[PDB]
Structures are given as structure tokens and as C-alpha cells.
Design a protein around this ligand. Sequence first.
Ligand SMILES: Cn1nncc1-c1nc2ccc(CN3CCC[C@H]3c3ccncc3)cc2[nH]1
Length: 103
Amino acid sequence: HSDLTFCEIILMEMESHDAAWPFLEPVNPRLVSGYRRIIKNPMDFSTMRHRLSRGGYTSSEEFAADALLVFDNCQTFNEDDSEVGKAGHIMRRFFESRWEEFY
Ligand SMILES: Cn1nncc1-c1nc2ccc(CN3CCC[C@H]3c3ccncc3)cc2[nH]1
């Protein structure tokens, strides 16, 4: 697929983005009070990398659903003016802008 090639490009650029630091690894619920209760379906860039490395994305749309889940969870748990919330808004707009550039 050139479908999955563009997801490799997008994921690589997100992994290396300055604002990616809250989303590189699963949130550790032992360290973030209330996260387990509030967030029903956690997602992060390393989980997406692993799923991509296995070929577990059958389409670019499944990839995008995981990316959007990262940012939906971020806005659910974090206030828009919190440090993590501000990073999540940067990353979300970056993903949207880059996604439109390929589709
Ligand atoms: C609240 N939250 N909601 N989405 C993402 C986040 C979030 N990611 C972080 C990434 C690094 C961090 C920074 N630290 C704080 C202690 C350990 C580390 C950490 C690692 C894994 N999980 C939580 C904390 C907070 C972080 N807080």
C-alpha cells in the first residue's frame, strides 16, 4: 500500500515531534491518578508503532482511528490549558494537517 507508506511517514514525524512527549508511551496509571477510571480505551504512539510493525492495520482509516483516539483521550483527561493538553492540541492539529496532505 501507498496507504501504509503514508502512515509510516506520519507516524515517524509524530514520534519525532517536540510536542509528542506525552504520547510516546502508554500513560502509566500508577503515576496518573484517575486515568484508569476516566479513559476507557488508552492509545499511544508506541502502541501504534507496534501495531504497524506487525501489519495490524488493514487500512489507513484504522491507523487514523488510533491517532484520533490518542487526541480524544488527551482532551478527555487533560484541560486545554494544561501542559499535556497544550501538547495534545499541537499534535492533533499536526496530524490533521498532515493527514489532509495525503488524503
Ligand atoms: C496525563 N497524561 N494524559 N495523556 C498523557 C499524559 C501524560 N503523559 C506523560 C508522559 C511523561 C510524564 C512525565 N513523567 C512524570 C513521571 C513519569 C513520567 C510518566 C510516564 C508515564 N506515564 C505518566 C507519567 C507525564 C505524562 N502525562
